Symmetry: D3
Subunit: 300 residues, 6 copies
């Protein structure tokens, strides 16, 4: 079992190459120093066929992340949008996770970015949402907005998420809750966080936490459903006494939270607002409703 | 021009594979999330032959960095020590830079480290030292000791070093001076920093900076040459009014600093203490001296 | 003495005599501060003695216990009824009420395993309100949101408040202004802080306690057509404000005439402060039938 | 099972009161606001008899802590020392943990005429698992870190309870800067290449047990360094242990799932643990000033 | 030279000759930085030379003196009339005005007891390619002022050492201006200007916390609302500025100066953006009287 | 009563000028932006004559401060040393406080083409507070941040924070303030370095965010010469509360004992034994009663 050994094609520098041929040299610069940007995109089976959810937003963020790191993607947004569709279409996938990733090649081994060639790959492949997960606050502090570029989804910056996730798992939990350098709640290991108190939705301001696309989708869905939503600084004990809490992310969708640091969240099961938003988001991404058709890009 | 199209061998998981055949899949976990550890080792031409300078300290630190990241190196320290010498000998190198690197394989794409295979790679290949360099203080804050593991030499953590080095170069300088989150001088982008005032050597405490092996080596040489050395917190303007300043690193060796942020350092020239320590370090690594033979391991 | 009084104290389900409400000297909360409490007021209304926002104080008491992982052995309706009994059975026309939850004297370690949860409720019975008070910014930094649970009203957390208040008093002032770890204005020693500048009300965003009296002022400010903005405030921003005042359960609405020697506006209670102070007293005294749910008759 | 329903006496404002009768009113000021200071002292059985270890240092620190909180103890240091000796003697304790505690009475209920009460109560592995606390240790300008105050232990209770719920035994505290500060209630030490490293007394406790280890390390020829320590510097240390009055020397074999050294009690930890025990038990006549006979 | 020139300067209730507007070298504010000042512009309008937002600059001047416990020995009406006098008496068509409140040379200690307060108002006549093509900005390695170390709401004299250090750094790095970050790492302001960005048609500016409540900033908020632009005050990171569609500085002396590059990252297309051009044109039409609105903001001289 | 209407001379840009003639234009750049460096120097009455204490260290720190601020002093150290002695000699001062000050002139007005001017003024020099102890209140203003202001340079505009803190300590009933760094640890007084004694050992904050005071450096020398153990480390405010002794060091404050901090009595509330010996040693040194360290006393005539 391996992520490298499987059938299909991977979009690699403009061409569709076989899956096991999509390799890079062991002295690849991003492999050793972390300078790279990537995306996480999902394709869902809809009544209209396989559709990618908010492809343009993920492609724009990819270019934004590369622009932050001074990495010139040798392609336009149209080609990357088309190549991301091709990554799912040319594999005949009914539903997939998509990993567009921009990295520096194996041209040089120094810290200077000059001389390094920019490579782009796009790989696509096929109770947590029900009752709720267990969360433990991480002892590792979340990224500092002047140490790592928090608006960029960069490869090397995910060590902190991995350390925190391993700590949460070794502590008996399913996910970690990250605090910013100021001590306020920021996000999960790879998800944004929302809480509900007295029918009002609260979520941390986009300061140190990543401007999640699933987060933005729930902000739009909440307004359309008439929910009052407040962006403000949230403390860890404010999460303890919330009626509801859930995570948002491309991979996690809307995942309810039932316990943080041993504190039961409300009644300890998926709350009414969480279920309404979770259902609305799933119907949106799966094409169960004609609403927001501009957010669904058919792959074929 | 490329770092992959090369003639030679690279130590790849217990086997000496051809340089062009030392590849990994493009969905390598460390490639996407930066979770990995590496070292930077130099080999010098001594009167006794090609020797690796302080091989034991670099292998010990490599295992420390892996131990910090909960990465299990599937080889003993002796096996890594023997394989490091093999990367220099089997390539017929008179003087070499060695890059041992430990990374997670292309087994999974989730943030959980479970199921990931640990691979080990050891690749080896062949005026500023005498003049001194221009330095500019980085606007990017150095790593935070509770966000990144500052004692580990991890791959993904060097995004901050590349951002800083590019800023320094775009500003017309040669290197950046990093400040910790408290505003005190920490290190260079890839080197440790030292200053001299009234014949006393000062260097930042091993706090947010990497415990450099060249740093620790200079501590030994400074004591052998009768220089009082004090480890304390240093401010940027204390560097401005120092009599001397220099950088230490495996690649940088002993590099004098003639100017910081436009402020000339002393006489704007390699001062007496820096030159004596620089010659003492070069005589040590090239075997021109006699003592510390335990720090020079023959490669053949 | 606060122990030698005539009356009753609601103690673990029953009304005991005031001097009989004792606890052992090795009580866990007494040695480690792990406990939560509330400050509630009862006012005389045309309908009789009524507790102001009893439900909000009881809900916050349970929230503070939930934060500290303390299981209150009573439901919210029992605590609500007990709080009314603390005022009624003491024959109080207007009262301050102190519900408090603490760990008993079953152990002496830092672990909470085996500790019994006890609940007590004790209820007992002008120029500052009109002329304003002197405030000196505290040299003690206010609580850190990840060091202490700032949303919980915990016993041991008030050491910081006592240090700041005594510092302000020895400095010739009446109250202290707390700054958060980042240097922004947080609150007073035991009150929230508001400022007025060009007819707009500004208050720090919630390292400060989400005060119930602060919440009523938001409601009263909107009812009286006042624009209110929640944002980070600096100490010098207070110096140049037109008005400033504190808000708390025990202090109600206390104007601020001077901060750090800087005169605030005209050096006395301002217009907006007067109307909010008037609106708050009219609300708690039942002078207006509005927000009748916020006045629970003690009966 | 309760800490109140016990036999014995408790020193309570100058006199010896029966254990069950040593009570205070439920509106005690320290109970509601945390304004109080305390000490943890141990008595050990020595060949000369039951002896309190460093009674003078704990009593001095108790008056220091009170002084920090502007609390005037209504007794001199000699009276407190003698009362501490009596708390062990009059209970017929061969070895005891002693809890002197100073607190404000139930005179007022405001935040500003409070009476100061004093009580003194006395009663009778290869390494532990440690998890770093997600709670930050006390800030040196928010709470008085040199004073051993009652209300400041909420942070310790939250961290210890977090470590236990996570499957560990003790917590490791980080200061607001992210550097290793201490354990839940104990100082922390690490050993790397025969050298002892302990966090510089920043947000630290200035522990008396820590101060004795400095002396015992120097007498056993161990170089000791006080500096800032990071959490991952603990991961790669050869040894690690906690020091406290009630914990003495507790070895640390694992921090955040990282095995410390060989995962067992190390040589330096063993030598310092035996030296501390031989010191407090009076095995040798060394540091006799640090042992005060109870009788 | 700013001293050897003809003209008059308002000096403590009297108009003295420009070369005679002197103070002793042991002046307290000169040595310890305790003083407050303003930056005011006058423009040519169809009604004549008019000061832009004279009331807002005088009010803030008194606020800054109040923060520093400095008593201005004059009323706001007298300072308004003196600011107009510094422009009218000098026969200036368009000028920059420097009202400055400082402590005299009464004592040399750090205590303010005994120091007399002086008020000076000087006005003198007034880069155009940068105004239309954008400037190069480099983030400052010097951290912006801390809200509990210096009084950031006051426009104080000594607090501008930090601005000078950062401007010198940016210039030595090849750029025209510095971008300042607060102690927490978020974007605060330029060296002497407030900063704005545009992303998907929405204007973003740092919340008034560690930066100065700029009057030009307050004017742009009004001009943005009148043009239907959604404006959001929030914390901004340096890399959020990298990916912004537009960016520009605001200040009395800088007007609306677009930003084309930050830390080597091209800002959008690398030139003045559409939203910036509309606000810049609106600001010039406002201060020069091309529009009739906001007659309060143009005080004829 | 004023610091300008006095008889005597002031060294002003290479020449001595009459005291009342030592003026600068009111648009002086340092006057408006605080960018300038200065020193505080003392001349004492010694058996060999009026002598400046550590003239070289104060002149070297002035050039260090100007080097940090990128200010080019148009004069050399030898000229400044000679001018500093002239400022005392030519005024016939038996003892004096000297204020060497480097500042930008009135050439420009933006944040270039600025001329550097130098002035050195000297004037003749609380005794009950010198032998009994002062009251100290911890300042609510945070001390300077090592990356916001240049804490090793003695710059003009940076002393706003000292004035804000000193006024607070006085309005609270005290004589001096105790400053805490942005991390909460003890840094210094408003303009003095702070020392504490506990069990016969001297503790003082490490040269971190506080000023590397020359008087502090002399005490480290004198403490070593008296066999005292001295430790540099991070000190909390409550560590000062429980110290046996505490005092301030500075050029103007010399050695000032501290009897009370935040209402906490320091030890016995009077000048401790260690403070008295170090105060005696410092006064004997600067006044020439001890002939040791002859290079630290530079005769004026």
């Amino acid at each position: 079992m391996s992520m490298a050994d499987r059938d299909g094609v991977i979009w690699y520098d403009g061409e569709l190459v076989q899956w096991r041929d999509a390799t890079t040299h062991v002295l690849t610069h991003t492999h050793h120093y972390g300078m790279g940007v990537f995306e996480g995109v999902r394709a869902y089976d809809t009544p209209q066929g396989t559709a990618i959810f908010r492809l343009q937003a993920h492609t724009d963020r990819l270019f934004d992340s590369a622009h932050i790191m001074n990495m010139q993607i040798p392609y336009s947004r149209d080609e990357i949008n088309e190549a991301t569709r091709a990554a799912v279409r040319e594999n005949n996938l009914e539903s997939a996770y998509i990993r567009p990733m921009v990295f520096y090649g194996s041209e040089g081994m120094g810290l200077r970015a000059s001389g390094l060639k920019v490579h782009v790959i796009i790989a696509a492949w096929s109770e947590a949402l029900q009752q709720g997960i267990k969360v433990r606050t991480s002892s590792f502090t979340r990224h500092h907005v002047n140490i790592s570029m928090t608006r960029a989804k960069s490869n090397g910056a995910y060590i902190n998420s991995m350390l925190a996730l391993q700590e949460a798992i070794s502590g008996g939990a399913d996910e970690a809750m990250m605090l910013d350098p100021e001590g306020y709640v920021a996000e999960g290991s790879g998800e944004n966080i929302f809480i509900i108190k007295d029918g009002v939705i609260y979520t941390p301001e986009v300061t140190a936490c990543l401007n999640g696309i699933t987060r933005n989708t729930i902000l739009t869905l909440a307004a359309e459903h008439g929910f009052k939503l407040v962006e403000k600084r949230i403390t860890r004990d404010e999460v303890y006494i919330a009626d509801e809490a859930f995570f948002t992310g491309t991979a996690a969708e809307v995942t309810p939270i039932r316990e943080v640091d041993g504190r039961k969240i409300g009644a300890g099961r998926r709350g009414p607002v969480t279920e309404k938003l979770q259902k609305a988001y799933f119907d949106l991404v799966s094409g169960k409703t004609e609403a927001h058709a501009e957010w669904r890009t058919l792959v074929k």
